[PDB]
Design a protein around this ligand. Structure first.
Ligand SMILES: Brc1ccc([C@H]2CN3CCSC3=N2)cc1
Lengths: 281, 245
């Protein structure tokens, strides 16, 4: 029974398969061919590396029948520890019900869920995991199925990837009043920090967009991390510009308190509708 | 019980095993799993999840050294057509691009063909090959004029459709109160709803009044007003109005 198991294990790296237990080579075997059942119905080192995220397939009743191999690079837990176990056993209960109804039943899904992280910004273990917000976009497909890619939002105090011209940092109160802005934004959007300071972010969005920000803002707060959609902030002397911003909530590491919201703001467009003027400013 | 449920599930999944008159044993069940995978995509998972595709460009000049075929499903272009990324991207993104040419990550709006652009989140890294970018671009999920007011009625925001709907360029309208443009007979009524939409915080009332045209013609108009609140403070920063001829 050990002989059969260890060449089952080693035709699933023989390094990692050398160490698998009974129950888990079972789960990995079972889920490998289950996944293959779905791929037949849909139809690498660089594909995998070139993702700021991992891919997961999750059933309508919640099982994780496949996760990205690079999973461990983002969340620490490797592919083999969590395959076949429930997603509900690794994400925030306050998010669970929302996860439930994303698994359920328009095909396209896009949301944020907090998982468990056991990789430090090296490695710690389950009793000391921290919750990590993941931006997930995918399809729900027919037994039902969820196919999402999950991107962690880079934390702006600890970044690995460079930033080009067309991005500008920003700090806000928790109600999103500008309480600090990048100096370049003037060249970008045409405001000095001076005017923006003490000003509600919400009197600079174009009106059709304000309702969609509220959701981004409440995601930001409830989860503390978020990516907005595209939206357009109104510009210096008329027109607007299009932005996408990663907004994360930063805490004082001393008094465990929310201190402010910092945002990286990718500018996606130059001024548009430059002639037209929208707001008093 | 769960090892057995794995025994049974495995066998149900092995057609070679579950196409049999009986249920064999674990040594065997383990053995036929082994041969059944000794017998025997990621890009499909990618394109099925995010509508992403892979591509490989030279960093030095920005010309493509590989394109995944997912380009055709993702953005309707032929793999044969996909050259230089600068030609594929919106002109206003060349600059952005050039400083992205360690890992890399950005956004840019690229053309689709049959001039329409689609914004695409790009992710990848630089590998040596005089170097190359290895990236994955993924796609995303998604008569009247609308104005917006401070609590007192002063136009804080209007879209260009005001000139088509009331004939005033935004600027004439902005800064002034609405009741400045209302007909005398209707003005408290306008103010009434303003006195009301706030009292009924959250959701809409609608009110109708004669608005002043630029050629001075009083025009019947219907305005659907609701207060908009800060999701944090519950501060009523403004009330949003769509004013409809
Ligand atoms: Br999510 C989210 C929504 C809004 C914001 C701030 C940042 N910023 C840049 C110009 S306009 C504006 N509002 C941050 C995160």
């Amino acid at each position: 029974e050990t002989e059969v198991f260890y060449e089952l294990a080693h035709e699933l790296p023989h390094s990692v398969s050398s160490h698998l237990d009974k129950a888990s080579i079972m789960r990995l075997a079972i889920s490998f061919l289950r996944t293959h059942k779905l791929l037949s119905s849909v139809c690498d080192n660089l594909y995998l590396k070139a993702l700021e995220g991992f891919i997961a397939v999750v059933t309508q009743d919640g099982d994780m029948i496949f996760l990205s191999e690079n999973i461990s690079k983002f969340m620490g837990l490797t592919q083999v520890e969590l395959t076949g176990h429930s997603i509900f056993d690794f994400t925030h209960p306050c998010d669970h019900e929302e996860i439930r109804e994303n698994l359920t039943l328009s095909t396209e899904r896009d949301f944020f869920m907090r998982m468990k992280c056991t990789v430090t910004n090296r490695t710690v273990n389950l009793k000391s995991a921290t919750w990590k917000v993941l931006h997930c976009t995918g399809q729900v497909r027919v037994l039902s199925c969820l196919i999402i890619m999950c991107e962690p939002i880079q934390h702006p105090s600890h970044m690995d990837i460079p930033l080009d011209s067309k991005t500008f940092l920003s700090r806000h109160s928790m109600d999103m009043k500008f309480t600090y802005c990048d100096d370049r934004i003037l060249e970008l959007i045409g405001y000095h920090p001076e005017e923006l300071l003490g000003r509600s972010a919400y009197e600079f969005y174009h009106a059709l967009d304000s309702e969609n920000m509220t959701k981004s803002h409440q995601n930001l707060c409830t989860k503390g991390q978020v990516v907005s959609g595209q939206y357009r902030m109104l510009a210096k002397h008329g027109g607007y510009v299009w932005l996408e911003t990663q907004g994360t909530v930063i805490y004082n590491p001393r008094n465990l308190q929310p201190q402010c919201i910092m945002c990286v703001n990718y500018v996606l467009s130059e001024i548009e509708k430059n002639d037209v003027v929208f707001s008093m400013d | 019980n769960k090892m057995t449920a794995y025994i049974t599930e495995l066998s149900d999944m092995v057609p070679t095993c579950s196409a049999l008159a009986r249920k064999p044993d674990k040594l065997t069940i383990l053995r036929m799993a082994v041969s059944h995978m000794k017998s025997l995509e990621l890009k499909h998972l990618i394109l099925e999840a995010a509508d992403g595709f892979l591509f490989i460009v030279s960093c030095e000049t920005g010309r493509v050294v590989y394109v995944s075929d997912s380009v055709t499903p993702v953005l309707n272009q032929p793999q044969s057509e996909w050259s230089t990324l600068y030609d594929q991207v919106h002109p206003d993104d060349v600059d952005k691009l050039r400083e992205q040419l360690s890992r890399r990550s950005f956004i840019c709006r690229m053309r689709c063909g049959t001039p329409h652009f689609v914004v695409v989140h790009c992710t990848g890294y630089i590998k040596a090959w005089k170097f190359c970018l290895v990236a994955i671009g993924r796609l995303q999920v998604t008569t009247e004029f609308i104005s917006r007011h401070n609590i007192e009625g002063i136009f804080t925001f209007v879209d260009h459709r005001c000139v088509a709907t009331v004939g005033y360029q935004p600027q004439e309208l902005l800064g002034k109160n609405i009741v400045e443009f209302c007909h005398p007979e209707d003005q408290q009524l306008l103010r009434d709803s303003f006195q009301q939409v706030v009292k009924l915080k959250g959701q809409v009332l609608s009110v109708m009044f004669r608005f002043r045209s630029k050629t001075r013609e009083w025009l019947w108009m219907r305005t659907s007003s609701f207060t908009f609140q800060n999701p944090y403070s519950d501060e009523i920063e403004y009330i949003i109005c769509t004013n409809t001829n």
